[PDB]
């Protein structure tokens, strides 16, 4: 049963502003074969379907925004939104993909 | 273009059961996995399983929450993807995802906008 326990539950900033968000797992997703960490980021608008933001840990999938900085390994990983745009108001998943699929919790962002 | 299809569900009497579709078009279907998760009202996404793609022979995996009363199978004669719930609760009264997936990214690349299901007498 891998859990992954994200931090925090919600937060409110206002555009432009410097944040980040932090996801810690029950179980050391780092594959040593490939030696790669198996977590990925996804953002899910109000109202709309998901949408993967990052794998790998750090890896940006294509089309996404040099704002959004995927770190960490292991147990602990992190994402970064540099200068928060209106577009990112949502909710942040982290997901395993070590073993099956594990969603998180996720991070509610505000924008004020 | 890539394209998900999700499709089939409405309200359901509890006990019962529902068929889900899932569409697809833009890229090669068997060369994928395909999940379904799904969202209540107000709650995280949660994982159901998968169907793998050819090279893994398209076997099945679930979560433990839904092995044994939810099945996973594919048409890949036509690209489209099925979910079979069974015994269902208003704990699975929710929006099911069907999402492109498998071994190059390990994550869900594609997603439909989603299916409704509401579970209620
Ligand atoms: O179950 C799979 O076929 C799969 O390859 C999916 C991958 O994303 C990953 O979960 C992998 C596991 O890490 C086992 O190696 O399993
Ligand atoms: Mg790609
Ligand atoms: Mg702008």
């Known amino acids: 049963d891998i859990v992954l326990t994200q931090s925090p539950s919600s937060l409110a900033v206002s555009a432009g502003e410097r944040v980040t968000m932090s996801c810690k797992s029950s179980?050391?997703?780092?594959?040593?074969?490939?030696?790669?960490?198996?977590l990925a980021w996804y953002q899910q608008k109000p109202g709309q379907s998901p949408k993967l933001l990052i794998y790998?840990?750090?890896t940006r999938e294509s089309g996404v925004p040099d704002r959004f900085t995927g770190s960490g390994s292991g147990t602990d990983f992190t994402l970064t939104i540099n200068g928060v745009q209106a577009e990112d108001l949502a909710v942040y998943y982290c997901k395993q993909s070590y073993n099956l699929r594990t969603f998180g919790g996720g991070t509610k962002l505000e924008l004020k | 273009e890539v394209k998900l299809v999700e499709s089939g569900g409405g309200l359901v009497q509890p006990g019962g059961s529902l068929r889900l579709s899932c569409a697809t078009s833009?890229?090669?279907?068997?060369?994928?996995?395909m999940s379904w998760v799904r969202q209540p009202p107000g709650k995280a996404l949660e994982w159901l399983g998968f169907?793998?793609?050819?090279?893994?022979?398209?076997?099945?995996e679930y979560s433990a929450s839904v092995k044994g009363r939810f099945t996973i199978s594919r048409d890949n004669s036509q690209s489209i993807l099925y979910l079979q719930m069974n015994t269902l609760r208003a704990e699975d009264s929710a929006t099911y995802y069907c999402?492109?997936?498998?071994?190059?990214?390990?994550?869900?690349?594609?997603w439909g906008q989603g299916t409704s299901v509401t579970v209620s007498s």
């Open positions: 999402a492109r997936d498998g071994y190059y990214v390990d994550a869900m690349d594609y």
């Open positions: 179980q050391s997703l780092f594959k040593s074969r490939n030696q790669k960490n198996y």
């Open positions: 833009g890229f090669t279907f068997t060369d994928y996995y």
């Open positions: 790998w840990a750090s």
């Open positions: 169907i793998r793609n050819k090279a893994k022979g398209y076997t099945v």
